[PDB]
Amino acid sequence: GEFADKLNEQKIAQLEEVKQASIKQIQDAIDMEKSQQALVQKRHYLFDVQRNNIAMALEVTYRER
């Protein structure tokens, strides 16, 4: 009788870790993708701020002259 219960509870326990892993991994495929998307567009802006800053600073300078 017990033969089943231990095995069964074993068998469930498994798919319980299986569903778990599975969520946790796909959440990670997810994070990775956000990391990427960010490094994409995202990062250029830093340099864009910088280039913009220059452009302005020359204009102000020209005008001031």
Partner: protein, 65 residues
């Protein structure tokens, strides 16, 4: 006011002054001194350049903070 009118006497003296061409009438060395003094304050106000001349320009490089 009627006697008060008799302006005449002032004009005449205006007239003899105005009729005089040889600098400012009855010089007195002070005139130049005062002149020079005020001529100096204006230098202070307007700057140490030759106001008879068109200005030089060397422009500042831009500045970044």
């Amino acid at each position: 006011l009627d006697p008060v009118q008799k302006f005449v006497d002032k004009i005449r003296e205006y007239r003899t002054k105005r009729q005089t061409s040889g600098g400012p009438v009855d010089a007195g060395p002070e005139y130049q001194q005062d002149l020079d003094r005020e001529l100096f304050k204006l230098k202070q106000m307007y700057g140490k350049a030759d106001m008879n001349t068109f200005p030089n320009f060397t422009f500042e490089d831009p500045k970044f903070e």
